Subunit: 284 residues, 3 copies
């Protein structure tokens, strides 16, 4: 009744999308806030508002942009989510999962994701990038995993294994490209902690995450990764570090969304170029 | 309106059960998947589908077996749940609690529980058993405890103490019987971490649970233990170890439900015999 | 439809309150159970049952007292919540937040909060007080933060920073007053862990909280602190220690609500006097 992310409902959305554009995409992309410039450069693009697509989640309470964009990047066919859905806004498990399962039915085999996040590991500075190699899902441990509910068997198994959720060869490709352009000094690898949000982590929470072996903390990405891994889509996820929360606690410095967006502004053009090349070089 | 697990609603279920069978059970049992063979050996048994019992939770979305079975084991009178309710399927706190409170009103004084779980402690191997001596309830710490909601005063207190939830004399009895049959080399004791599920723990989550002093991790049992302790029912809970998740992470080996069920097949007959004897020897 | 804690709904409640009493309060207070004697000493007081105020949450399932009390303490104008709302009772994020946002619209600039809690740090004894200097919010990390949902922009920002949620000058004032009355030997400072509840922490959970750097654990206060910090209200929060859970685990001693209330009885008159003086000395 609130629309389950099942096979029938995802197929109705895919059918509408397929007859309004001619694109069969191979690659899906979800971009962090302030990091979406690539979506404006999509060639021969079709913009489809969420509100026009059967069974897509209602987003008018939050407002702001919400479109699916289809077209070509680097000669590859892609579908993009413009205006991300975050669980701290109150969206349900079924609302998060439906767009990813629609990507699957359209033919997406690889999903590329970027986000903004806080740095925990003392090696991370403002403006650095982290290739995510694993995660700690505090909502999942505490009975709010994105897959709680009946399993949708056509998409995947009841009990997924997440050992390979972050594709190893895609991490090596993203690192190689940073080396060819001489910005590998900005690129780290690390473990991502999912904090449901929307408050930033307190100083004592940051210090707990350091003891637990977390390198980065943020409020997104893990739900989409789990839905993708469930249905067999490979994932690359990159965090842009806004601040080092441990260092900020030692110096009594606050974090705010204005400072976050300025960091996004500083790195946006480098990230757009990086991901355009990753898309171009991605293995068939 | 979704049916609260209160005194009136539990009594209507108990009244139907009492007039369809003649069994006043003293012992309740909840068996892990693939571990239910004992329930087929119940003597002079009465099988009651959940769907026939007033106020029992609806389970048709998930499908598969769901019956209450009453009868005799080892000369003792028992009630069994055949087809367990798990919180990762989306059942509410009230749906989990009602069958246990029905057991209470029928006269159950001891609840025996088995499950499948992942090994964290490096001493545990595939096929070992763990007598649970305590737990870490990540859903409870994070506002999804099975008792969140109004308290049902006829069953127990607002703020239960869980210091004695896992009965010490029942652990010693289960260990004694393993010694008399010379399989005590398979039996450990340990602390159980509740992961809401349904994804298996990621490698970085497993390594966090090791740092936190957890010996075993699984997706069930803690909700039923808490409802039982609330209303004064003594508990014995045993985990069958499917794999050692820490060792699997070091060697890059995946876990899947097929491997889990094969372990259950390998130990099912030993576990049935063990629990039949525990039931026989249980103190009045 | 379950009544959102938005600007329009909070203003209707404030408007009713404002025309039934003549008090424009500067200070809000929320008192722990057994710790409410100060509210009976409020001078020229007006008692307003929650059930009479537009948009206030329904509390008849739990029963027991629920009033807002307005009047004067130490020459200062205050509003008190008599009968606290706890999230383990099943109240929603919107029900917790609405009374605090009503306090804001009435003119409250400082919120004083007391609670009962378990001691983790080995320096804490039954009957001690802890000035809270920071927190670890396990519900917030696990997608049950009090602010999950649409943001109410008139009250505060989408992503609050909690670095200064516990006002430093108010902690120094409360400590100074304990020194002037020679009971500073009872007063500590510490980090508070929020356990959703309503079961007390198990022995293995207590030992985990010790490893994570928590000094005290309880079932309240963090939700109200976060709503207050969101809308710019300064906070002082004090825990009264009922028992030391680590020492109790080593000696196999149970905790129960009866023992908790006896500790509250033993300290109630000292706490009332302390807070009356804090209220008197609070900076304009
Ligand atoms: N410190 C931080 N900076 C940016 N995004 C975040 N998400 C969570 N914590 C964050
Ligand atoms: N590794 C594992 N094996 C079996 N059951 C589990 N439940 C949670 N983790 C598990
Ligand atoms: N041990 C304890 N004593 C009193 N209140 C508590 N709240 C949580 N744990 C507590």
């Amino acid at each position: 009744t609130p629309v389950v992310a099942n096979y029938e409902n995802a197929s109705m959305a895919a059918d509408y999308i397929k007859r309004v554009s001619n694109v069969l995409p191979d690659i899906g992309i979800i971009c962090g806030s302030g990091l979406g410039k690539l979506i404006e450069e999509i060639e021969e693009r079709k913009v489809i508002p969420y509100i026009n697509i059967p069974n897509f989640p209602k987003t008018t309470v939050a407002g702001h942009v919400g479109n699916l964009v289809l077209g070509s990047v680097g000669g590859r066919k892609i579908v993009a989510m413009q205006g991300r859905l975050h669980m701290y806004e109150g969206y349900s498990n079924q609302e998060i999962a439906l767009p990813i399962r629609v990507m699957k039915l359209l033919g997406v085999r690889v999903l590329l994701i970027t986000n903004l996040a806080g740095g925990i590991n003392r090696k991370l500075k403002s403006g650095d990038f982290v290739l995510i190699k694993g995660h700690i899902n505090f909502p999942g441990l505490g009975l709010n995993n994105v897959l709680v509910g009946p399993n949708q068997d056509e998409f995947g198994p009841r009990f997924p294994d997440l050992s390979n959720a972050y594709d190893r060869l895609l991490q090596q490709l993203a690192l190689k490209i940073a080396q060819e352009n001489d910005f590998q000094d900005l690129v780290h690898e690390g473990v991502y902690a999912f904090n449901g949000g929307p408050t930033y982590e307190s100083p004592d929470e940051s210090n707990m995450l350091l003891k637990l072996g977390c390198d980065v903390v943020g409020m997104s990405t893990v739900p989409e990764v789990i839905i993708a891994c469930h249905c067999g889509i490979k994932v690359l996820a990159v965090s842009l570090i806004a601040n080092n929360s441990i260092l900020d606690a030692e110096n009594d410095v606050s974090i705010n969304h204005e400072k976050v967006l300025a960091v996004a502004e500083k790195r946006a053009d480098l990230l757009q170029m990086w991901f355009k090349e990753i898309i171009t070089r991605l293995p068939l």
